[PDB]
Amino acid sequence: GLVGKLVTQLEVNCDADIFYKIVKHHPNVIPHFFTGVQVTKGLVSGCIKEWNYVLEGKAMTAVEETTHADETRTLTHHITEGDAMKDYKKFDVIVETNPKPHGSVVTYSIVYEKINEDSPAPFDYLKFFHQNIVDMSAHICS
Amino acid sequence: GLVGKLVTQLEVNCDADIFYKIVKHHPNVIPHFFTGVQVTKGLVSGCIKEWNYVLEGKAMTAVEETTHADETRTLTHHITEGDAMKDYKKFDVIVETNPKPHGSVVTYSIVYEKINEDSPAPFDYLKFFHQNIVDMSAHICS
Ligand SMILES: COc1ccc(Cc2nccc3cc(OC)c(OC)cc23)cc1OC
Ligand SMILES: COc1ccc(Cc2nccc3cc(OC)c(OC)cc23)cc1OC
Structure with a gap:
């Protein structure tokens, strides 16, 4: 099948609702910048960003639309164009x-559909997002 | 936190119960061998294996106990010793x-606890197990 999901899940010692608010509004262990806009539904609900970034030494671009759901503490980043879309249809x-049933559990899921069987699964992105949330978490404390 | 989980999930075009029976009783895209024993509860319920294998060029060993649950189509591989336990407590x-709500969804989950913060998360194992189930799946058809 061309369809799959990769997940990294980590425990963090921080209340879930506060940690969600931190992630929602939040650096550069990677060369990167973006331009773009905010989206409203007149309050900002999301954003659309064109990113320029370097992954494992290679410069790339991506267009990302982000939405959030405060009730479920979920952020969704939807990629519509860029280098990754040479490999993935979605x-x-x-x-x-x-x-946790204290502190919280953070889950990053990459939901993907390959263009064909020769496409890689996005382990490079999984490691990138993982190291990013590890770093952010290590700059928060009690 | 030192505690986390990595997942790779893939869709396969194969009935779930048959695919579970295939995985349960099943090669060498990696240098590897094992010695060990089977476990009974007088019917074999599991196995205990000492593996010798090469991951990303480096020879390693691991002691693995495997159990299965046919009702939930789940296999559990519990590592008690070897190179990985220099990095992980669990x-x-x-x-x-x-x-699927056809064919099925296969999930490999690596549930880990690091020895300390300097330990890597097991992306190397995730990629290994991923490429192994991709290969196995590509030798099965209708
Ligand atoms: C191709 O995949 C992506 C590429 C870039 C991004 C951009 C992005 N979104 C959220 C957090 C990010 C965090 C980053 O590091 C600070 C970053 O640097 C490239 C990009 C980020 C998201 C992506 O997937 C949602
Ligand atoms: C350190 O982690 C492990 C190391 C080796 C194994 C051994 C193992 N179990 C199941 C399927 C396997 C499949 C393999 O490839 C055919 C293989 O080669 C090293 C080892 C396998 C399991 C492991 O984790 C359960």
Whole structure:
């Protein structure tokens, strides 16, 4: 099948709702910048960004639309164009934060559909997003 | 947190129960061998294997105990010793096969606890297990 999902899940010592608000509004362990716009539904609900970035040494671009759901503490990043779309027909990244039954569990999911069987699965992106949330989490404390 | 999980999930065009039986009883895109024993509860329920294998060029060993649950089509591989335990206090690999709401969805989950913050997350194992189930799946058809 061309269809799959990669996940990295990490425990964080931080209340879920506060951690979601931190991630929602938040650096450069990678060369990167973006231009773009915010989206409203007159309050900002999301954004559309064109990113320029370097992954594993290679410069790339991507157009990303981000939406959020405060009730479920979920952020959704929907990629519509760029280098990744040479490999994937569909590429979405869903970030979920839930309390432990303390602190919380953060899940990054990359939901993808390959263009064909020769396409790689997005382990490079999984590692990138993983190291990004590890770094962010290591700059927060009690 | 030192605690996390990595997942790779793939769709396969194959009934779930049959695919589980295939995985349960099943090669060498990696240098590897094992010695070990089978476990009974007088019917074999599992196995305990000492593996010798090469991952990303480096020879390694691991002691693995495998159990299965036919009712949930789940295989559990519990690592008790070897090279990975220099990095992880706990390392388990859970393989689940479920029908799509056709064919099925296979999930490999690596549930880990790092020894300390300097330990890597097991992306190397995730890619290995991923490429192994992709290869196996590509030798099955209608
Ligand atoms: C091709 O895949 C992507 C490429 C870039 C992004 C951009 C992005 N979104 C959220 C957080 C990010 C965090 C980043 O690091 C700070 C970053 O640098 C490239 C890009 C980020 C998202 C992507 O997937 C949603
Ligand atoms: C350190 O982690 C492991 C190392 C080796 C294994 C051994 C193993 N179990 C199941 C399927 C396997 C499939 C393999 O490839 C055919 C293989 O080669 C190293 C080892 C396998 C399992 C492991 O985790 C469960």
